[PDB]
Coordinates of C-alpha atoms in Angstrom, one line a residue:
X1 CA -42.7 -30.5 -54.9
X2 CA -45.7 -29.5 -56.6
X3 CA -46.2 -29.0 -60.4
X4 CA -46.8 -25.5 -61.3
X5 CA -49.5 -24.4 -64.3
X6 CA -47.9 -21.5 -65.8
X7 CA -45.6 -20.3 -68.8
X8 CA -41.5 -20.4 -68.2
X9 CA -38.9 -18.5 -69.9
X10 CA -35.1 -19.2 -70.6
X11 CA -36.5 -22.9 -71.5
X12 CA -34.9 -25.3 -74.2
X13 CA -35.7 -28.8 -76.1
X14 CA -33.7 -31.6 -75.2
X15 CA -32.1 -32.8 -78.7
X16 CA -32.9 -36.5 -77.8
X17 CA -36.3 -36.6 -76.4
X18 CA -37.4 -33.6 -77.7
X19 CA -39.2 -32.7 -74.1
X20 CA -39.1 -29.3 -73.0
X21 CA -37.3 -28.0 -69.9
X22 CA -36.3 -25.1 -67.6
X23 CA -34.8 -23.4 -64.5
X24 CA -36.9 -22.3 -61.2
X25 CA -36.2 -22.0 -57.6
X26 CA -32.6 -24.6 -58.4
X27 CA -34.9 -27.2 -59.6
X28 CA -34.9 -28.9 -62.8
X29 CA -38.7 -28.8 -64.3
X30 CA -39.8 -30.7 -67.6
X31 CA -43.3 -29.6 -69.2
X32 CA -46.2 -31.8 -69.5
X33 CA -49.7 -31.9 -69.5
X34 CA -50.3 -29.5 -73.0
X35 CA -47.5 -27.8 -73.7
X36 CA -48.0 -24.7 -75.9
X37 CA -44.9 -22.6 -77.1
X38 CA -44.1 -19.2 -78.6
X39 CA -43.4 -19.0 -82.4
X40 CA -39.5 -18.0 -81.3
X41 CA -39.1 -20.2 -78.7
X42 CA -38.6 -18.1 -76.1
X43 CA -41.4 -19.2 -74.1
X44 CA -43.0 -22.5 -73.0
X45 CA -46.8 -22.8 -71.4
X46 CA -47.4 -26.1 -69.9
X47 CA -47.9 -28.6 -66.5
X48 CA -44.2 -28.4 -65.3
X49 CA -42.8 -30.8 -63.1
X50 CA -40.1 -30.8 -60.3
X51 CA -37.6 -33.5 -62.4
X52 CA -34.0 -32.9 -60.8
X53 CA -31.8 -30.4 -59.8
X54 CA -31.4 -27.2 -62.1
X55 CA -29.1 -27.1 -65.2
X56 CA -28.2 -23.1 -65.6
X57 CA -25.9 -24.1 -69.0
X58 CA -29.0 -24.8 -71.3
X59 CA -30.3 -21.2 -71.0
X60 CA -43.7 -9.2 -69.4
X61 CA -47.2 -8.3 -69.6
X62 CA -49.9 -10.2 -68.3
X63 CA -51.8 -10.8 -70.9
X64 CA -51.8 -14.1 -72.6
X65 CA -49.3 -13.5 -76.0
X66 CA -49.4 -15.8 -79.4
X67 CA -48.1 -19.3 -79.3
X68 CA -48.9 -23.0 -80.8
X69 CA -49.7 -26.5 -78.7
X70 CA -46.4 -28.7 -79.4
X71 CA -47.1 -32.0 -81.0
X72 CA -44.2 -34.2 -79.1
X73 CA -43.4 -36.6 -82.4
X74 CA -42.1 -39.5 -80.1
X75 CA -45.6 -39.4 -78.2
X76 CA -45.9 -43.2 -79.2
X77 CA -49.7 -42.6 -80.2
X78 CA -48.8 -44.0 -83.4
X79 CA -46.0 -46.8 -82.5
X80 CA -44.1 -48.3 -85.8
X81 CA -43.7 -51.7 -86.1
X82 CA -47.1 -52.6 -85.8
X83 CA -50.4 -52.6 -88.8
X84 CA -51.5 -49.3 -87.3
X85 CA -48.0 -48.0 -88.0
X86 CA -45.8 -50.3 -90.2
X87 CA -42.8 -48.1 -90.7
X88 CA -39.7 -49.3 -89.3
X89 CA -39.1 -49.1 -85.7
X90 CA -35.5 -48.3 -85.8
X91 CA -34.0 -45.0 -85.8
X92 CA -31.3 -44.4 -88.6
X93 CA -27.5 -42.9 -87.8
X94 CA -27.1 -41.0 -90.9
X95 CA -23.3 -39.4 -91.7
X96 CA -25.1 -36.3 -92.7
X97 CA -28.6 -35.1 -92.4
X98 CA -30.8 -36.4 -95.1
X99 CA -31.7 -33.8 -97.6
X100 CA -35.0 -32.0 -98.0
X101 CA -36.0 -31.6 -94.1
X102 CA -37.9 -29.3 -93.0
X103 CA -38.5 -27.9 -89.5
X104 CA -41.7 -28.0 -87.1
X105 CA -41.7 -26.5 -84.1
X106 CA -38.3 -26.5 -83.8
X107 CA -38.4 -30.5 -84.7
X108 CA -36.5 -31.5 -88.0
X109 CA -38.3 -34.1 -90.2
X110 CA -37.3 -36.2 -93.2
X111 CA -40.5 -37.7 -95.1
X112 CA -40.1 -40.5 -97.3
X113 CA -42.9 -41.9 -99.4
X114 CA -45.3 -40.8 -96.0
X115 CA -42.6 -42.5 -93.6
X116 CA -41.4 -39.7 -91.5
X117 CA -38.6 -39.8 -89.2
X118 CA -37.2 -36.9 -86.8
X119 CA -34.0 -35.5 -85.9
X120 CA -33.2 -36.9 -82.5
X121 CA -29.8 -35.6 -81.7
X122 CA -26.0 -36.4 -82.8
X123 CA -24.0 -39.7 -81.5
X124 CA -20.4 -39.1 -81.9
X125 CA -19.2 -42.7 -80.8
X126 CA -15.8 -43.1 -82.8
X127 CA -12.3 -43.1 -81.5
X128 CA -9.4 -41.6 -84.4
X129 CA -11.3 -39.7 -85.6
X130 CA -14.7 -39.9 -84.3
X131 CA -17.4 -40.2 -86.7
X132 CA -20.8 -38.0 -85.8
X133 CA -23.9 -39.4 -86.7
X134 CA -27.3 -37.5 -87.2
X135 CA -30.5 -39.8 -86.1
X136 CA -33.2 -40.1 -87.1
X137 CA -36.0 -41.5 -85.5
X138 CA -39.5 -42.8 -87.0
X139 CA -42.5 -40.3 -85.7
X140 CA -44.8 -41.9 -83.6
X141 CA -46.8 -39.9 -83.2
X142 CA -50.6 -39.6 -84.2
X143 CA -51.4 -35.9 -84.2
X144 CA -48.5 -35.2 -86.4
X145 CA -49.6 -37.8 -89.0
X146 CA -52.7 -36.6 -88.9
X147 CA -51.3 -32.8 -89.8
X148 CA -49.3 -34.6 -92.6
X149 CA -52.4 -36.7 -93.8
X150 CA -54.4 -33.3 -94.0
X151 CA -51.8 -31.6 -96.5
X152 CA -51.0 -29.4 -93.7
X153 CA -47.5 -29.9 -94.8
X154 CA -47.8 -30.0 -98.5
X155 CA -46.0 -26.7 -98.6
X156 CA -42.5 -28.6 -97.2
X157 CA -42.6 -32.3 -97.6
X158 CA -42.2 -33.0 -100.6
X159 CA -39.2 -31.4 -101.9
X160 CA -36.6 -32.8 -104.0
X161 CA -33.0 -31.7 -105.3
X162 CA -30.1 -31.2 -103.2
X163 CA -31.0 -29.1 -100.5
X164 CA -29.2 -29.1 -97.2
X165 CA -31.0 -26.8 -94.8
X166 CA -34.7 -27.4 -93.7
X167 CA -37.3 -25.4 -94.8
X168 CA -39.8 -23.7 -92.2
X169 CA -43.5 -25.3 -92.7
X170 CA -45.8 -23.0 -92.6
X171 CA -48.4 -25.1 -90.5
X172 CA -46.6 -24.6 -87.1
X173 CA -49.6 -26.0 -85.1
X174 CA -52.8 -25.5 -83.6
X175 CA -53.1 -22.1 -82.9
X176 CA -52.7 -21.0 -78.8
X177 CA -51.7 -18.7 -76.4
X178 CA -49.3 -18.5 -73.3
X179 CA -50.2 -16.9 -69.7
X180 CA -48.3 -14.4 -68.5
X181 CA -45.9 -13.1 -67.2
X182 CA -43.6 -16.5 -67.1
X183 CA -43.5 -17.8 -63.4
X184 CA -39.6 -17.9 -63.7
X185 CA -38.8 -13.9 -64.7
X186 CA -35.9 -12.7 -63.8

């Protein structure tokens, strides 16, 4: 099938590649090209592609409405491992999520000493009982160190003490906005 320009609704982000996806026509479509989103993440604007068959579980005007271009943190334009990006390759089970997160366009990152990692999903692989880990997975992505780099984060960061739940950065991205109405309305 063809890809289809346009903005869908009843989308979500996969917890392990962080890609965005949605439901149209029984087919399974994942956004690409640049992908903007609405603040609430109700909404995603982007190049979607015909992936698979449609997953229904994971679930307007027509003037363009408020949004942000999503900075995909495991874009690999910023690999680690290598001089350009030294941090450690490998992604980190944690029992619990580290402290002092804080959240991103709906990503959760951990920053340590200008290392930052990102929530990629649980992996319960236990038996009696069965043990759920939280990883983590070093960013590799440029534009988002280059937001970090800025200060554009300074509000979050760098927060110490023992705090469990994320804070919200201010900075949610470069400002954008979303066709409409989505192509998939009800």
């Amino acid at each position: 099938k063809s890809h289809i320009e346009g903005s869908f609704t009843n989308v979500w982000k996969d917890d392990k590649t962080l890609d965005w996806y949605a439901n149209y026509e029984g087919i399974l479509w994942k956004a690409t090209g640049v992908v903007v989103i609405t603040g609430d993440e109700t909404q995603v604007y982007a190049i979607w592609v015909p992936v698979g068959l449609a997953i229904p579980e994971n679930e307007y005007g027509d003037t363009p409405i408020p949004g942000y271009i999503y900075i995909n943190p495991l874009d690999g334009t910023y690999p680690p491992g290598t001089e350009q990006n030294p941090a450690n390759p490998n992604p980190s089970l944690e029992e619990s999520h580290p402290l002092n997160t804080f959240m991103f366009q709906g990503n959760r990152f951990r920053n340590r000493q200008g290392a930052l990692t990102v929530y990629t999903g649980t992996v319960t692989q236990g038996t009696d009982p069965v043990k759920t880990y939280y990883q983590y997975t070093p960013v590799s992505s440029k534009a988002m160190y280059d937001a970090y780099w800025n200060g554009k984060f300074r509000d979050v960061a760098f927060h110490s003490g023992f705090n469990e739940d994320p804070l919200v950065a201010e900075y949610q991205g470069q400002l954008s906005y979303l066709p409409q109405p989505p192509v998939n309305a009800p």
